[PDB]
Amino acid sequence: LHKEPATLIKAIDGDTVKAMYKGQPMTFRLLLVDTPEFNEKYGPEASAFTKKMVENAKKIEVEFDKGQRTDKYGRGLAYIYADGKMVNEALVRQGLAKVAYVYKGNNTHEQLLRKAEAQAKKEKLNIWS
Numbered sequence: 001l002h003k004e005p006a007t008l009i010k011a012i013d014g015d016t017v018k019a020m021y022k023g024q025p026m027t028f029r030l031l032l033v034d035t036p037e038f039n040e041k042y043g044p045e046a047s048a049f050t051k052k053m054v055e056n057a058k059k060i061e062v063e064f065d066k067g068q069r070t071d072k073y074g075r076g077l078a079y080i081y082a083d084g085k086m087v088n089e090a091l092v093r094q095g096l097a098k099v100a101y102v103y104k105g106n107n108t109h110e111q112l113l114r115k116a117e118a119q120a121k122k123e124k125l126n127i128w129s
């Protein structure tokens with residue numbers, strides 16, 4: 001996979017971010033994770049985590065997988081990096097997202113994220129507490 005440029009427009013919630021990509025506004029949904037909704041437990045905390053990460057970065061980048069690049073809602077499906085740190089992995093590692101929606105052909109980082117989730121579960125963090 002390859003990282004491509006994007007510019008933050010707005011952090012929406014724990015697993016969706018609006019960003020400009022190839023000069024057009026896109027809503028991106030993070031691959032391989034599921035954060036709680038804002039009105040659910042840890043929802044506000046996931047939203048804040050993702051917001052801080054993307055807002056504080058000097059740059060964000062998007063990385064598409066090998067498969068589908070948009071979902072049925074027209075959201076971009078990507079791994080998002082904030083100053084080179086993956087948001088999808090960071091959320092899982094802090095127990096603010098579960099590994100989820102693992103579709104074959106768009107699952108390059110599945111094992112990386114499963115290892116993060118095991119660590120968050122061992123530490124009883126957040127969703128795992």
Ligand SMILES: Cc1cn([C@H]2C[C@H](OP(=O)(O)O)[C@@H](COP(=O)(O)O)O2)c(=O)[nH]c1=O
Pocket residue numbers: 029030031032033034071072077101103
């Ligand atoms: C993460 C992801 C979600 N989706 C679709 C499946 C779910 O459809 P349904 O809306 O029918 O439940 C929805 C979950 O997104 P959210 O967790 O943002 O609600 O997004 C994909 O199709 N591919 C993906 O890789």
Ligand SMILES: [Ca+2]
Pocket residue numbers: 015034035036037
């Ligand atoms: Ca969600």
